[PDB]
């Protein structure tokens, strides 16, 4: 029943200080546990940042962090937070808040992506990738949504508010030459359904506070 | 630091067969309390790791018995006795006795399965895209195996290079297949200067490269 959630900024300028807050529910922070922060650069290994104890023992951090890390705990709000000063591009990664307990790291947060860049936030444009009758590969057709020109990572894409899950592929974003990201999310679906069931892609980009629900239907002459 | 080394760094498992990852530490992980603090975690893409094993052979609550851990001192071994399709991902070993805490670099596990030719689709741009200033034509290869495949873009019959981007999914948790998207970006001027757009897919599961096309408008 223990759940931890990370919150903070998705963009921090370089040489500035990264602040992240992990809120813990389902257990009191004043327990026999080491509330820890661990980071992972995307597609690479885990780097242990450090911990703050639920008791009275002093925190300990990774020497690789070059005395830039402070890990704090707030019992009244039941949360613990990471402050990392003088960030560079190397500090751009996925940050996990976890609980090292009597067994081992018991519970992890979902992970929060922090990107260190000077670039300005931009919301995405959503275009439908419509299926056609000329493109039916047997009995199933494919449709999707193209999400272009957003910054920074990530966006979340669901279909029919999560009702449609099977056969969906949301592709890794590819960085354009403009410095913005683009991805596509496609789904295969029985072509019969095309006549009756309506298909909606829900795109969410929190850094730009953009939420777009776009329905993908065949062309008006198809 | 206590350096943790995993082997191999890439492990393809054969169905119906067992699989074995090894993790070696530069120092003993035996603590003065008599316990050995080594742990095994599984990480599927886009989510945090899952705790599988702590204390080399004890299972975390809810972890199936098919995951097993052995070893002593500096040698440790994780075995997956009979795999599931969901078991793709990156596996990490971690010591929880020495500070700083350290993890292995991780072993990427992908499954071997029957070859399957990709289902190929082409998506022409919506009129909104044409109005937008730039246009993206999409060629999708769905649900193929193995990962290797080649996509070539042909406009009005001629090969077009240097304006395409590829993105590949991870091995699917259900049918252990891969999927790939190729996005071709042009100006609307360049887009309407031509008429026929096609992608030609070459893949092991295709006796001949398969071409999908459309006519502008």
């Amino acid at each position: 029943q223990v759940q931890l959630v990370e919150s903070g900024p998705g963009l921090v300028r370089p040489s500035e200080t990264l602040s992240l807050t992990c809120a813990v529910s389902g257990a009191s922070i004043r327990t026999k546990a080491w509330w820890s922060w661990i980071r992972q650069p995307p597609g690479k290994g885990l780097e242990w940042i450090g911990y703050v104890s639920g008791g009275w023992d002093l925190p300990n951090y990774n020497p690789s962090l070059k005395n830039r890390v402070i890990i704090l705990k707030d019992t009244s709000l039941n949360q613990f937070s990471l402050r990392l000063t003088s960030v560079t591009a190397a500090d751009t990664a996925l940050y996990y808040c976890a609980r090292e307990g009597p067994e081992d790291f018991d519970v992890w947060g979902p992970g929060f992506l922090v990107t260190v860049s000077s670039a300005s936030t931009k919301g995405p444009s959503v275009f439908p990738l419509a299926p056609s009758s000329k493109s039916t590969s047997g009995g199933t057709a494919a449709l999707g949504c193209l999400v272009k020109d957003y910054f920074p990572e990530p966006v979340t894409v669901s279909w029919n508010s999560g009702a449609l899950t099977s056969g969906v592929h949301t592709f890794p974003a590819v960085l354009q030459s403009s410095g913005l990201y683009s991805l596509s999310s496609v789904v295969t679906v029985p072509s019969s359904s095309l006549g009756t069931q309506t298909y909606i892609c829900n795109v969410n980009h929190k850094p730009s506070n953009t939420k777009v629900d776009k329905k993908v239907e065949p062309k008006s002459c198809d | 630091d206590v350096v943790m080394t995993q082997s191999p760094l890439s492990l393809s498992i054969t169905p119906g067969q067992p699989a074995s990852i090894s993790c070696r530490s530069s120092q003993s992980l035996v603590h003065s309390d008599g316990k050995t603090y080594l742990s095994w975690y599984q990480q599927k893409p886009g989510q945090p790791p899952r705790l599988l094993i702590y204390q080399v052979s004890n299972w975390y609550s809810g972890v199936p018995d098919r995951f097993s851990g052995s070893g002593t001192g500096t040698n440790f071994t994780l075995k997956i006795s009979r795999v599931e399709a969901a078991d793709v991902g990156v596996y990490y070993c971690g010591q929880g006795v020495h500070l700083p805490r350290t993890f292995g670099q991780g072993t990427k596990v992908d499954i071997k399965r029957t070859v399957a030719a990709p289902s190929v689709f082409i998506f022409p741009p919506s009129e909104d895209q044409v109005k937008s200033g730039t246009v993206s034509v999409v060629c999708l290869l769905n649900n193929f195996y193995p990962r290797e495949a080649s996509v070539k873009w042909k406009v009005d019959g001629v090969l077009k290079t240097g304006n395409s981007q590829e993105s590949v999914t991870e091995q699917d948790s259900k049918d252990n297949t891969y999927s790939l998207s190729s996005t071709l970006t042009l100006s609307n001027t360049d887009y309407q200067s031509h008429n026929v757009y096609a992608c030609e897919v070459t893949h092991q599961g295709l006796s001949s490269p398969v071409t999908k096309s459309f006519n502008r408008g």
Partner: peptide, 7 residues
């Protein structure tokens, strides 16, 4: 593990 290593 909690408490193991600062001992």
């Amino acid at each position: 593990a909690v408490g193991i290593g600062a001992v």
